[PDB]
């Protein structure tokens, strides 16, 4: 999965997340055509309660049916301020997309980080099952981990989450200024 963000001088913004699901999709290509096929069918629930590639589970709502579109977690997002473009943001990461994107938005709005700071900041993740608080290397100091563990979290350090490409737009006396960040994770 990969996300890209575009904003122009006329006030259009386009936030695109697209994918073949796994890295290199199904790993099978169309002979003669040179492209990899997706493995997007794994985003369905293939059996009630069966965890997919991202540990996500389902029942009736996300069961397979002919022509049905498998449930995604992709979250291409635009944030507006007074109806003008403010953020263009998104990320890959399967189940982690939702939490990655909201953390970047929160970092800007709640903590007044610029877009580079908001993207670089360590990320955590909770997805109900598994019942764990997923964190990143160097992302949480002992004091914070200790306090969260006391609350009843099971903290686990896992590979870095996401790959945010984000734009922040700020008005100027004349026009706007566009600020960008790619993700130090990849």
């Amino acid at each position: 999965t990969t996300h890209y963000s575009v904003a122009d001088r006329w006030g259009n913004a386009v936030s695109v997340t697209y994918t073949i699901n796994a890295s290199y999709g199904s790993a099978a290509s169309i002979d003669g055509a040179g492209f990899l096929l997706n493995n997007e069918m794994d985003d369905f629930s293939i059996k009630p309660g069966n965890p997919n590639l991202y540990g996500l589970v389902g029942g009736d709502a996300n069961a397979i049916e002919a022509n049905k579109r498998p449930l995604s977690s992709m979250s291409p997002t635009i944030v507006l301020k007074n109806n003008k473009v403010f953020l263009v943001v998104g990320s890959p990461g399967g189940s982690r997309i939702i939490t990655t994107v909201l953390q970047v938005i929160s970092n800007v709005i709640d903590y007044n980080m610029n877009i580079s700071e908001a993207v670089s900041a360590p990320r955590f993740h909770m997805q109900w099952l598994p019942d764990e608080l997923r964190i990143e290397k160097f992302g949480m100091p002992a004091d914070v981990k200790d306090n969260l563990t006391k609350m009843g979290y099971q903290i686990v350090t896992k590979p870095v989450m996401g790959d945010v490409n984000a734009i922040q737009v700020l008005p100027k006396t004349k026009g706007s200024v566009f600020y960008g960040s790619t993700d130090p994770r990849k």
Binding site: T1, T2, Y4, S5, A7, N12, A13, V14, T17, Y18, T19, Y24, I30, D31, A33, G34, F35, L37, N38, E40, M41, F44, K47, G58, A61, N62, I64, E65, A66, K68, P70, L71, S72, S73, M74, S75, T77, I78, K81, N83, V85, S95, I97, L102, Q103, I105, I109, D110, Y111, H125, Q127, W128, L129, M151, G152, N165, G175, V177, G180, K186
Partner: protein, 342 residues
């Protein structure tokens, strides 16, 4: 990264970002640039960028309209509920993950053409040229690409088609710095250049897809390809501390739960304690926990199932979640009730 004249086009590959940025410099709009990038990434970032997959675009237009494009893959016409299970009702290992049966009907090419035709200003023929040049002439394998290719090796090895495209002669791994040329991909992109989306969903390319599927235990047919349709959908919309949030609606769960989680968080003054405070992490994590429990029961393609989006993004529901959050203890996942009673 800063621009004060034409804006920014940002992706995970510098060659694709450069292509998008050039479209902006040459007077194209954000949609024009996004289409050029979508095709460029199909060449230079094959782990993820694609013409064989699908996705979503959320678009805010100059005139103030906000729209969403669904170019998500569809289950083929022959797909069935239990297609990945054996006679005894148990998952067939890797059947949904590796190989031709794991594929939905691709939407990317349809999506790129749809947004260009509705909202773009440049011709597809011109926006796709940079991608074709990269496929025909090649580009350098990056350090990370060499790593991800190496990791995919045993998967590629299962399929004669992929062994042809993603290895050097004798099925050898590409290495950092090698020039990667994709002649058949260029043929496919050239069909799209000349014929538009019909160059993928009909004609020679559709024939190649149908016949390779049949040979290899897949089920996508010309009928699937000819019937592939994008959908222009309303985005899901929320607010957070005076900002408007525009995100992807079903068949993504992403925008709904993003808005739901932020709605819960909105009931706390997170700014008071600042970034990385355990009390703030706790509120967010408990909101996440409920949202993902909700996802597992309520979420799917709304064209087929009833998805309570409006209920899930209702601030009153979020307040109810917030009020269950204990100062210094969690609600174990085993004790979460999807919808809480909704």
């Amino acid at each position: 990264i800063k621009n004060t004249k034409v804006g920014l086009a940002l992706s995970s590959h510098p060659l694709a970002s450069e292509i998008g940025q050039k479209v902006l410099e040459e007077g194209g709009n954000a949609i024009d640039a996004a289409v050029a990038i979508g095709f460029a990434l199909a060449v230079v970032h094959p782990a993820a960028g694609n013409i064989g997959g699908g996705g979503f675009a959320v678009i805010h237009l100059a005139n103030g309209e906000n729209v969403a494009l669904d170019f998500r893959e569809k289950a083929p016409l022959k797909a069935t509920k239990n297609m990945f299970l054996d006679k005894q009702g148990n998952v067939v290992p890797k059947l949904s993950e590796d190989g031709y049966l794991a594929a939905g009907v691709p939407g990317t090419v349809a999506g790129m053409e749809a947004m260009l035709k509705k909202y773009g200003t440049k011709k597809l023929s011109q926006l796709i040229d940079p991608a074709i040049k990269l496929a025909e002439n090649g580009y350098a394998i990056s350090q990370r690409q060499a790593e991800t290719l190496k990791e995919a090796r045993e998967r590629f090895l299962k399929y004669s088609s992929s062994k042809k495209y993603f290895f050097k002669k004798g099925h050898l791994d590409y290495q950092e710095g090698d020039l990667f040329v994709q002649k058949d991909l260029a043929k496919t992109l050239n069909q799209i250049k000349t014929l538009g989306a019909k160059g993928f969903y009909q004609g020679q390319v559709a024939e190649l897809i149908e016949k390779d599927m049949k040979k290899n235990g897949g089920i996508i047919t010309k009928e699937d390809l000819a019937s592939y349709n994008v959908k222009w959908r309303k985005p899901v919309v929320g607010s957070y501390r005076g900002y408007k949030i525009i995100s992807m609606s079903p068949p993504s769960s992403g925008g709904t739960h993003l808005i739901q989680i932020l709605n819960v968080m909105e009931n706390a003054d997170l700014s008071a304690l600042g970034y990385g405070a355990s009390k703030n992490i706790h509120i967010a994590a408990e909101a996440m926990r409920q949202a993902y429990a909700d996802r597992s029961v309520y979420m799917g393609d709304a064209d087929f199932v009833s998805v309570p989006v409006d209920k899930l993004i209702n601030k009153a529901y979020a307040k109810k979640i917030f009020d269950t959050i204990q100062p210094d203890t969690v609600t174990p996942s085993s004790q979460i009730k999807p919808g809480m009673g909704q």
